[PDB]
Amino acid sequence: SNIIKQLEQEQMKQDVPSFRPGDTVEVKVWVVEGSKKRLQAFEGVVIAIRNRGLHSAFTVRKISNGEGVERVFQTHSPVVDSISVKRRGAVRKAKLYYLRERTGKAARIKERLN
Amino acid sequence: MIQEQTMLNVADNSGARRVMCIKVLGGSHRRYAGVGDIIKITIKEAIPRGKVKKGDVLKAVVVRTKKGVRRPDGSVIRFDGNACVLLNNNSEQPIGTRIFGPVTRELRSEKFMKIISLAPEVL
Amino acid sequence: MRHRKSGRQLNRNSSHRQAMFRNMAGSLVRHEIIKTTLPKAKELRRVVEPLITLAKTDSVANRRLAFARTRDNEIVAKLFNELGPRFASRAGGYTRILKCGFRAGDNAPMAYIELVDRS
């Protein structure tokens, strides 16, 4: 409906960079410890995107301290300050769930040239 | 989301390698355990000369679950495996002197300040 | 419950339904008027009208798509050479259902479905 569309598009962020699955992004999230706010960086590969307007999300997967960790960010959430595509990967799928059973040499993604 | 018979990896250098949850503490008829809640575990595998032996019964706090936790904005942090940190049966303080792998913001409290201080990364 | 769902099962499996609707669509565009039961006729529209809509623009890709959904080259050829220019201005609704009573053998509510400008 028009009411829901108006309500969501008046809250959407207009500076969201364009990205695709397979890209290596670096998202800066707000961390509030005690009374002070800081910026924690989380960098990994985008393994899934869910386009739903204001309810859009994307799942980033990284290998932190030897343990695979993935986090699903809400694209229009104010906790995300900025997103930056460090490197663009070339895949032929919309959801890279197969990466969870791969480590090291078997989980490399070819760069998306041109 | 940890319940009885669940095997977990150990996130500290306390000597245990693979533990099994035998009760979810903190309430009658309780089904699952998220992060930051005590469970009673048994040790099913240990390293040769560690601080704990195979078969000891003691407490532990869960620091990573494969189901993950949810934050007030709707996000979710999922890990590749279930991991816990062994605690003393009476004081409920960590046995080891180091933490392996990341943890989350759900733990920052006076009870587990030692754990979040020793953690290599607090997501 | 089947809240906001569409599509009649018609007491057949999915492959049988797909094949039956393909055959029925071919028969309808071949003869220009056919007689079938009322639910099957109401479900037949959702398959035969997009085919005509696709057929409105003659292209190799559209013909291959129509061929994939009908498996009858004569049917595809008729659709693109006649039914497309004939219905070139219509905004959908290229069929008409006329309820025609009840079948003698099993008391099924029958109907005739025909192209709008048959005459």
Added chain:
Amino acid sequence: AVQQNKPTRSKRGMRRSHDALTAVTSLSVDKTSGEKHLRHHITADGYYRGRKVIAK
């Protein structure tokens, strides 16, 4: 699974009281050919709402 006392014809009629059929309230008259037909269905000659929709 089975009865203990034979039900009466009275009980049988009471159960069958709702099994009656309902006759059609009124038929429709075609505006051109004048014959009667079921509402929203074509007439027995092939007409519907004046126009002759099916040949014979």
Added chain:
Amino acid sequence: MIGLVGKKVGMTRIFTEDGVSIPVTVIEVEANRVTQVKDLANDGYRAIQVTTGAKKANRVTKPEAGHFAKAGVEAGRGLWEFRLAEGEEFTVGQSISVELFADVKKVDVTGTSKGKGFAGTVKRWNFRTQDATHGNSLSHRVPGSIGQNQTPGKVFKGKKMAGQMGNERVTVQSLDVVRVDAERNLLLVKGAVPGATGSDLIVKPAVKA
């Protein structure tokens, strides 16, 4: 205090600058036009009867048309009633808009719940299923026993059995009002209210404070 009658537009979320995502339900609350005021002198109790929305002029029957005509108000899609509190007056032709709830903090939303049709005991009353194996015979989701052997030789009234679930009035209590948008006749409540999209909702101030 009286309430208003709105329509469920759908569900969405509101982001706060603190980084909290409040899930809200969008209720479009158009103006409620009073059509009859009931008093102790004539009806033995105090209440108002309001209407909202519009209805097709060829669809409104003559009795309710005359009822609306007496009040001098255009026909709405229904008639709802609110009991009047002490010291609360309203005139007949008065229109009440969504700005009534401008400083209330919690509301009670009542609507007709979604219909699940004929629901089994397992779905309707959270009964446990029986074994899917171990020799079980045609009794995987049946309700089991319903009585005792010949001393209470009947089934007790009020037993939980399968039947029609939903499509009945349900009140959800103490929801936080997130935003009152008077400019476009909107009310955003925190949480989920009963009923499908487009249904009617009755929003009243929270009885439990």
Added chain:
RNA sequence: AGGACCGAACCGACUAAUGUUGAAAAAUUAGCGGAUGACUUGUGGCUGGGGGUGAAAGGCCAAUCAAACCGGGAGAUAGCU
């Protein structure tokens, strides 16, 4: 070479489900055992009831077996209903 191995026809029936006024007075589906042998099968014959036959369960002997079926003594007897 083999009462050898895996595995179809063929022979059998270990487990579960369905069916128990069944499609069937014992079967169907998914699995299962043997599958060149003490195997299995077609045609014809022989062994008769206190008798036969039995790698033996009192099993089988025409949907009937701690003594078949049919006719006769026979309207056995019944302090029982």
Added chain:
RNA sequence: ACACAGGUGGUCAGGUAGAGAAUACCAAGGCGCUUGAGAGAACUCGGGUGAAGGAACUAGGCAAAAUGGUGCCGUAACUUC
């Protein structure tokens, strides 16, 4: 006892993939199983998929799920070799 999801010996043996008369799809050839039409509730049958956990179910891993081919490397206790 049925126009019965059962039982019945011999002969013929095509193409592709396959070790194969297994199995899948076809040729020659023959059928769609003598009530249909709707709707898409509980519940029953035969199946498909499942977050987190992996036998905590239960008399019992019953049943499901899982392994499954060919070539090669490598293979323990015990043994009548």
Added chain:
RNA sequence: AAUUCCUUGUCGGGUAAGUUCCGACCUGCACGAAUGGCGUAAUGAUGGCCAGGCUGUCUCCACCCGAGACUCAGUGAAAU
């Protein structure tokens, strides 16, 4: 113990916890040497226990595909 009533005898292993299992002990109600005693490689749709993988078996059920169940038309039982 296919055998022990008392008995879940006592100790040890496995398990956080083991009336079952495995290894001993001997106080064998009431084992025992061709109505065979004790072992035994291989074999078993044999009985009991444990472990890895695997899973709706379970925590705790949810959705989907068909055949019935429900409605319409035709034929039309049964136990009691």
Added chain:
RNA sequence: CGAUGUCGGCUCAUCACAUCCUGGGGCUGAAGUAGGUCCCAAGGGUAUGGCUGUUCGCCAUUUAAAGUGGUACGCGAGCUGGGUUUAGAACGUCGUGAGACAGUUCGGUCCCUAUCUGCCGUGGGCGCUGGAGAACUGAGGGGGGCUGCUCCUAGUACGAGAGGACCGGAGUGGACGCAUCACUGGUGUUCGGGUUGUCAUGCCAAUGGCACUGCCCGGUAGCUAAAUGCGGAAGAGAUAAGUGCUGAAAGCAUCUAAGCACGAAACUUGCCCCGAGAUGAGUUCUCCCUGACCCUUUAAGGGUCCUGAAGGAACGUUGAAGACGACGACGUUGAUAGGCCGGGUGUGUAAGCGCAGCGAUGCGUUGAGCUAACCGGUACUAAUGAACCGUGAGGCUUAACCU
């Protein structure tokens, strides 16, 4: 004894209080925390596993608690069939033997399409006194009622210390119940793609059929829990055990005999839902009908002509409503459903052509093509002019007004 199926388990319960926890209180060999015992109180709650067929019991670890019982030691026309309890077989024992064992061990068919009562839902008919469309009142009925931990009061009162409150306030959980899909996910055989074997469209290329949706990888809407909102209350009335004030009988004493006050999750309300078939059939608002006559048994009588209203039903397109009825929207003065246009989403760079490579294949056009149930529009198709049911001023007796 012309059959009343039986131990344990699963599912589902319901009642009693001789109360396991929470609530109130007296005494204590009650300093505090924590206890012992008794009285009142059934509103709610009252574990998961190892072992055995087990009930029972022991053990591990929780919990505020892991109650005792009744209901054919509840429940097999709801499920199981391990034990026991048929036919087979063996061990120990007894008997010469056939066989037998509250001795054990292996294997061993659990049927029924619900007629009546009962219960969960959902309709048809008639009534409620002219008919109809709505919205209510509330006599009555159901649901719900559990509780932890941390912090402040306060390391205060108490205590030599160890330890550590009552009363009151705030936050966050476990289990249960209701609702929902906005978020995280599952399904999504009606959407897209990868790929193996074969067959067909003459063939290449591209597709389609079958192989569990052939095997998978994703996934729209809807439905869902594991996902997230909400709830148990506060307050009032009268009380139980209990604590009292004044006060004789009985110069004193005395909670009681007269009179007055406090007191619990129990009772009645307060919260949610059904609810005038509440035949005691209720109340309020609104709409519709203002014709002529015959007959005999003369009365709440029957009949004819004209008339057919408000409204309902039927038919059609249908729904986040639904087994079928029912309920809701719409029927040309129309967005009810299907199609169509645009958008969103899902899949992942379609086919054709060109270029590079001997070729598999890659690159460009190209984030392309296809896209169900979604969103915003659009009468192109189907929702007919009618016809049917329902009537034509509504009985009698009192009372208060009106003329």
